[PDB]
């Protein structure tokens, strides 16, 4: 059995007093006119989903419904037996069908009636709102509006995915789910919420929320924007099976002197950077270009590894904006350098050692020696590798182990071409890119077209259909019927009338002309 939740499931979103005001807030509320499951206690204690939070309501005569169990495997136990409310988070053993008769991290001890509750779990806190009110109705939930107040807030840190109710045996109840919807809450003169608008229920509610009013005057209003959503994603990278020789840079037997640093070129390979970032062998791992955890999603036209030995106190000089004995004379980085500087202590590898010597960006100008000894930290040798990333939108050759997909065309998709992402429809192109051009650009510097990373063909990118959404309505004093115009779109992805102004849904197309009342556009009213 199921019922109509009507306007139930609203609560005071915070602990602030307000009056004579319409307040807009986004929180987990029961959607208006939602579908809620109807349970009975006649002649029924199932395990139900918790999802993002649960709306619970019950109608009582003899106080049969007394509690709930929340958790995963089914643990938070809430029971109201007589006058003593008991809340526990303990490793209690439950039955396959728990009921009442007519290791702990937390513990607390304190139809004729309608009892409403809201149960939501945010950042480890189990928040309970409630309201009690007298009723005179057996058949179903009463229709009407009331806002629930916060009562209990349990600092547990509990994972809740499912819950179960508790009945006393010798009382119907309803279960709904909360959604992150915006509501316009109407506070009367005494600060009581007396009404509410569900901003994602229908186009009239959207208009009421947009105008921050429970009354809408006759006319046409722009309340939202229509956007076609992607159905699937596309991940494209060159089909390269060779892996990048980072091990040959970092695990090298010997490193070069700082005055004569080595430069190893990395290309046409799969670059797994999780090894370098997660490894605990490094004393420092500072990125100036991109975050170290994004390295396996984005990719480069090339990577260069600059390998050399410095003193520990010289580590601070290998950075954009720095100056000094190394930064100015031995190894200079661009102040707009893109890349990561990785270094580690080599005291047990290099020290004895006078074979290491020191004296524009990336200049190798070919004189003093270092005295590296095992008993020296600031004067101990460090092995430093600088990974210079050319991340300009050129053909990529050095990309991480990101799983690829096939290519989907003539549909709205979420695409990734060599680390470049966006949403749009991929179509056939008659454009010809030069051999060195991987991406094209529009006036806004957005991607216009791409060369497919695996196939040497050009795809045009046409961002998914969108436009403003306007609600056409008579004043709410006469009617709550509305019609909706989807601006500058076809009657495709969206009693339908196609006009030059867009796709008009809900208005009847009439052959007889009339003096203009509510204008739509392009000769249509």
């Amino acid at each position, epitope marked *: 059995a199921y019922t109509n939740s009507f306007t139930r499931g609203v609560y005071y979103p915070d602990k602030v007093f307000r009056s004579s005001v319409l307040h807009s807030t986004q929180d987990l509320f029961l959607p208006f006119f939602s579908n809620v499951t109807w349970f009975h206690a006649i002649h029924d204690n199932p395990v139900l989903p918790f999802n993002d939070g649960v709306y619970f309501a019950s109608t009582e005569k003899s106080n049969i419904i007394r509690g709930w169990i929340f958790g995963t495997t089914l643990s938070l136990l809430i029971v109201n037996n007589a006058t003593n409310v008991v809340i526990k988070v303990c490793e209690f053993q439950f039955c396959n069908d728990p009921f009442l008769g007519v290791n702990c991290t937390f513990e607390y001890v304190s139809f004729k009636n309608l009892r409403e509750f809201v149960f939501k779990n945010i950042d480890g806190y189990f928040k309970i709102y409630s309201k009690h009110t007298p009723i005179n109705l057996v058949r179903d939930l009463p229709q009407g509006f009331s806002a629930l107040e916060p009562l209990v807030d349990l600092p547990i840190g509990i994972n809740i995915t499912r819950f179960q109710t508790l009945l006393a045996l010798h009382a119907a109840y309803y279960v709904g789910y909360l959604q992150p919807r915006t509501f316009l809450l109407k506070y009367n003169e005494n600060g009581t919420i007396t009404d509410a608008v569900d901003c994602a229920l229908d186009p009239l509610s959207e208009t009421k929320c947009t105008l921050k009013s429970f009354t809408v005057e006759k006319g046409i209003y722009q309340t939202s924007n229509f956007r076609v959503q992607p159905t699937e994603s596309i991940v494209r990278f060159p089909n390269i*099976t*060779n*892996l990048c*020789p980072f*091990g*040959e840079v970092f*695990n*090298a*037997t*010997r490193f070069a002197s700082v005055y004569a640093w080595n430069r*190893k070129r990395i290309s046409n390979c799969v670059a797994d950077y999780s090894v370098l970032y997660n490894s605990a062998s490094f004393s420092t791992f500072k990125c100036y270009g991109v975050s170290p955890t994004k390295l396996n999603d984005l990719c480069f036209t090339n990577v260069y590894a600059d390998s050399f030995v410095i003193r520990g106190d010289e580590v601070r000089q290998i950075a954009p904006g720095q100056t000094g004995k190394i930064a100015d004379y031995n190894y200079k980085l661009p102040d707009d350098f893109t890349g990561c500087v990785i270094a580690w202590n080599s005291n*047990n*590898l290099d020290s*004895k050692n006078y074979n290491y010597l020191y004296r524009k960006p990336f200049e190798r100008d070919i004189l003093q020696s270092y005295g590296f000894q095992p008993t020296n930290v600031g004067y101990q040798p460090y092995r430093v590798v600088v990974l210079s990333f050319e991340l300009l939108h050129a053909p990529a050759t050095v990309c991480g182990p990101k799983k690829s997909t096939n290519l989907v065309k003539n549909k709205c998709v979420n695409f990734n071409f060599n680390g470049l992402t966006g949403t749009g429809v991929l179509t056939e192109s008659n454009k010809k890119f030069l051999p060195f051009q991987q991406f094209g650009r529009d006036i806004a510097d957005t991607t216009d077209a791409v060369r497919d990373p695996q196939t040497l063909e050009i795809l045009d990118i046409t961002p998914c259909s969108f436009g403003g959404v306007s609600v056409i309505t008579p004043g709410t004093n006469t009617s709550n019927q509305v019609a909706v115009l989807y601006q500058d779109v076809n009657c495709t992805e969206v009693n339908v009338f196609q006009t030059r102004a867009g796709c008009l849904i809900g208005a009847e197309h009439v052959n007889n002309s009339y003096e203009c009342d509510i204008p739509i556009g392009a000769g249509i009213c």
Partner: antibody
Framework: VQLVQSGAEVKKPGASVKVSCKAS????????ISWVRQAPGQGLEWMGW????????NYAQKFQGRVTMTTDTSTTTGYMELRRLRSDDTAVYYC????????????????????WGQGTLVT | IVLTQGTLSLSPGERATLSCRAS???????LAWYQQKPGQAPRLLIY???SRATGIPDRFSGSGSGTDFTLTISRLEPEDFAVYYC????????FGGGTKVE
């Protein structure tokens, strides 16, 4: 990671032997292939090293001009052909995954012959 | 660079020291130690003179410099009765004679 090789063979002096090796569980082109021989009653002798990435091959002076190494990345295999055999060449020939020299750059690494196969006896 | 390492007689539970000497100084990061059980291929235990190879028990440890390096076993197991070899690989590839542990 596992390495497997061909079975045992018997050859007469002047003959050649083609010793094969197959491997799996790792990126083939990231690691080289090293060959080590062990004559009965003897210790280990290095014969050579081949890059699975670019064909760069190094040999022990003892086998320069006697051994030809080659790889095939499409089957994940490597081969070592020993020409102009002598009775002096009796040994078990072992194939190992190499992290002693870089597969891409040819430079020395900190590591060794990290994963050895069973080895094959050639008389 | 020729390496020199005949039979070490020790009971299970005793500490073993296995020596390797080079005719020339070698890089401290280019020494590897292997363990070969009879009838089996050798396996890598220690690399870079002192670093422990993946899958190798903590009872194995190495150290050294110049021309004098060692491999030690804190406590011998019945599974350690194998021939241990030292490998020099900074300048060409050389193996030592091999030390037998009983």
């Amino acid at each position: 990671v596992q390495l497997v090789q061909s079975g045992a063979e018997v050859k007469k002096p002047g003959a050649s032997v083609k010793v094969s090796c197959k491997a799996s569980g790792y990126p083939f082109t990231s690691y080289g292939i090293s060959w080590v021989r062990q004559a009965p009653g003897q210790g280990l002798e290095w014969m050579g090293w081949i890059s699975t990435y670019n064909g760069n091959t190094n040999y022990a002076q003892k086998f320069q001009g006697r051994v030809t190494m080659t790889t095939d990345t499409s089957t994940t295999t490597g081969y070592m052909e020993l020409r102009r055999l002598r009775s002096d060449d009796t040994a078990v020939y072992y194939c190992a995954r190499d992290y002693t020299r870089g597969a891409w750059f040819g430079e020395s690494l900190i590591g060794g012959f990290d994963n050895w196969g069973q080895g094959t006896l050639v008389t | 660079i020729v390496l020199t390492q005949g039979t070490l007689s020790l009971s299970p539970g005793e500490r073993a020291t296995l020596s390797c000497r080079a005719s020339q100084t070698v890089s401290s990061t280019s020494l590897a130690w292997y363990q070969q059980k009879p009838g089996q291929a050798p396996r890598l235990l220690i690399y870079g003179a002192s670093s422990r190879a993946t899958g190798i028990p903590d009872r194995f440890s190495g150290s050294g410099s110049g021309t004098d390096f060692t491999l030690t076993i804190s406590r011998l197991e019945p599974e350690d009765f194998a021939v241990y070899y030292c490998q020099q690989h900074d300048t060409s590839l050389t193996f030592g004679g091999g030390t037998k542990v009983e």
